[PDB]
Design a binder for this molecule. Structure first.
Ligand SMILES: COc1ccc(CC(=O)Nc2cc([C@H]3CC[C@@H](OC(=O)NC(C)C)C3)[nH]n2)cc1
Lengths: 274, 298
């Protein structure tokens, strides 16, 4: 089903169909690391968690991080045999491509090389970004996990005007659901479920199946497998509580929720196992 | 990178360096945009990464096709479909005789189809001007140059300010709106529509304030009734002179009743009330070009 209201700029079922049909073009493999026998799933978590901290330092948007995450996972599905010393170059170059796509004034190249502690030069990043984009067939416009959460939050707070393009939702509850998704994305087994399913399952744990189905269009049976998989991650967030909305200098308060944050969730990921 | 021979330079501008190339074995002609990466300290330009990713998912008959992206030496080649002329040259060549009304209607209809396709794919063009509208010798017109384009989310957030060339920039951009979306492309197309009819730019301003006043002198100085929230916009000033809205019988004399109606809805001050590309296709101005498809009322 389609949760979007009647759209004045296009057919509501047409816009939603295109968004759904796009996910058929972008493929994800939850076991792409089997193509790289020398790598381990925990290495992917450490890299993504490091990219989260890099985004918060330069105040990059959450969309920028999840773009780099999707670029990283899809590029690895096309490659074979990667050493751990090459992971940092692929990760920071994915963030470099993502920053230039999403940010109005992205950081310069040398800043991306600066955060690598000299392990990645500027020319290495420029070489890596071309190999990433060419291997991905220049398919660099996916619907990230956080993009779906942005859609689900707008539909949850729709009025009689049905204006779905003007953002209107509480920022504090948004960053709480994104906090759960930031943990689940560290586990490589999340790729088994589509990005739209993961975002809807995280919203369900902070609300209900009725609100989930109203704003996502997916029935409870579609996300039950994802919800049951997300079960350990949700309680670890519930045991420690939810974070507060932060303020960033130079960033307007009406956009502060869109800035990527990072708290030490390393031990939070291992508590979800078993 | 072979089998292609440069025939003529098409142009050098914000897009890059465009050449006309022709395949020697097949006779196929293309447009090659050359990007010399040795001069780009930030790697592939952001406008290049944006345009490539957007066009590889915007396959439409009224959108200039990106055929291939070739990385040869320290350069990046973008292979485009070739069209022989842009709309601005065609309007200037037709300035004395005037573009025939059926051709104006056909061109606007195709432009609205390509624009409705972009907007349904959640993509804003943000630089619709006659120089970016290309025509072939078979009656087709296509949208080109997506370097300033951006995919918008649902809901949108604050995007880049001061977009669109000045003559075709919507009034909400000139007044410093925080959010914007598909309405800015419709305004540009409305300016292009009137320019085809009158063979002259509708609002040829030389500054941001002069552009806004030229719009005010034609459509009237807007107020809260015609545009709710206009007096609260950052660049709005209570000292704006009060001009009366001009009768479209003088703004676009050759335009009939259905034409003036469509143009009025494309030039509505309120972006929320401005007609959409999809709705414009259903306007009675195109009642002879297209027929309504049966709608499932389920
Ligand atoms: C010297 O002789 C000439 C021959 C033909 C022209 C018109 C033309 O531009 N044809 C194209 C262009 C194209 C592509 C090249 C990049 C894209 O366009 C732009 O981003 N910028 C354009 C609007 C300049 C589409 N495909 N076909 C002009 C002069």
């Amino acid at each position: 089903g389609s949760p979007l209201p009647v759209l004045s700029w296009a057919n509501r079922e047409e816009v939603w169909k295109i968004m759904l049909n796009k996910e058929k073009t972008y493929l994800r493999d939850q076991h792409f690391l089997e193509q790289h026998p020398l790598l381990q799933p925990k290495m992917r978590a450490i890299l993504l968690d490091w990219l989260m901290e890099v985004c918060e330092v330069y105040k990059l948007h959450r969309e920028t991080f999840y773009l780099a995450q999707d670029f990283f996972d899809r590029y690895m599905a096309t490659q074979e045999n990667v050493v751990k010393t090459l992971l940092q170059l692929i990760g920071i170059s994915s963030l470099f491509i993502a920053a230039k796509l999403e940010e109005i004034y992205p950081p310069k190249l040398h800043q991306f090389a600066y955060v690598t502690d000299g392990a990645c030069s500027g020319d290495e990043i420029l070489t890596m970004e071309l190999m990433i984009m060419k291997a991905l067939k220049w398919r660099l416009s996916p619907l990230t996990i956080v993009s779906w959460l942005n859609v689900y939050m707008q539909v949850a707070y729709l009025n009689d005007l049905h204006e779905v393009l003007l953002p209107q939702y509480p920022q504090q509850i948004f960053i709480q659901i994104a906090e759960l998704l930031d943990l689940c994305v560290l586990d490589v087994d999340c790729l088994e479920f589509p990005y739209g399913i993961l975002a809807a399952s995280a919203l369900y744990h902070f609300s209900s199946s009725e609100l989930m189905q109203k704003v996502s269009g997916y029935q409870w049976c579609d996300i039950e497998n994802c919800v049951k998989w997300m079960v350990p991650f949700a309680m670890v967030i519930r045991e420690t509580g939810s974070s507060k909305l932060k303020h960033f200098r130079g960033v307007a308060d009406e956009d502060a929720h869109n800035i990527q944050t990072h708290r030490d969730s390393l031990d939070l990921l291992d508590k979800a196992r078993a | 990178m072979e089998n292609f021979q440069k025939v003529e330079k098409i142009g050098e501008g914000t897009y890059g360096v465009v050449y006309k190339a022709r395949n020697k074995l097949t006779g196929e002609v293309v447009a090659l945009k050359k990007i010399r990466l040795d001069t780009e300290t930030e790697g592939v330009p952001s406008t290049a990464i944006r345009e490539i990713s957007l066009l590889k998912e915007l396959n439409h008959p009224n959108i200039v096709k990106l055929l291939d992206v070739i990385h040869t030496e320290n350069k990046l080649y973008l292979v485009f479909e070739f069209l022989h002329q842009d709309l601005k040259k065609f309007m200037d060549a037709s300035a004395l005789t005037g573009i025939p009304l059926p051709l104006i209607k056909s061109y606007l209809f195709q432009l609205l189809q390509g624009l409705a396709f972009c907007h349904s794919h959640r993509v804003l063009h943000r630089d619709l001007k006659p120089q970016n509208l290309l025509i072939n010798t078979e009656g087709a017109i296509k949208l080109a140059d997506f370097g300033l384009a951006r995919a918008f989310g649902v809901p949108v957030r604050t995007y880049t300010h001061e977009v669109v060339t000045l003559w075709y920039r919507a009034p909400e951009i000139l007044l410093g709106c925080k959010y914007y979306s598909t309405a800015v492309d419709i305004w540009s197309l409305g300016c292009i529509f009137a320019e085809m009819v009158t063979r002259r730019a509708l609002f040829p301003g030389d500054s941001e304030i002069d552009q806004l006043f030229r719009i005010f002198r034609t459509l009237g100085t807007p107020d809260e009734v015609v545009w709710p929230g206009v007096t609260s916009m950052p660049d709005y000033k209570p000292s704006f002179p009060k001009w009366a809205r001009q009768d479209f019988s003088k703004v676009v004399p050759p335009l009939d009743e259905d034409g003036r109606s469509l143009l009025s809805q494309m030039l509505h001050y309120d972006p929320n009330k401005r007609i959409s590309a999809k709705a414009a296709l259903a306007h009675p101005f195109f009642q002879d070009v297209t027929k309504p498809v049966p709608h499932l009322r389920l």
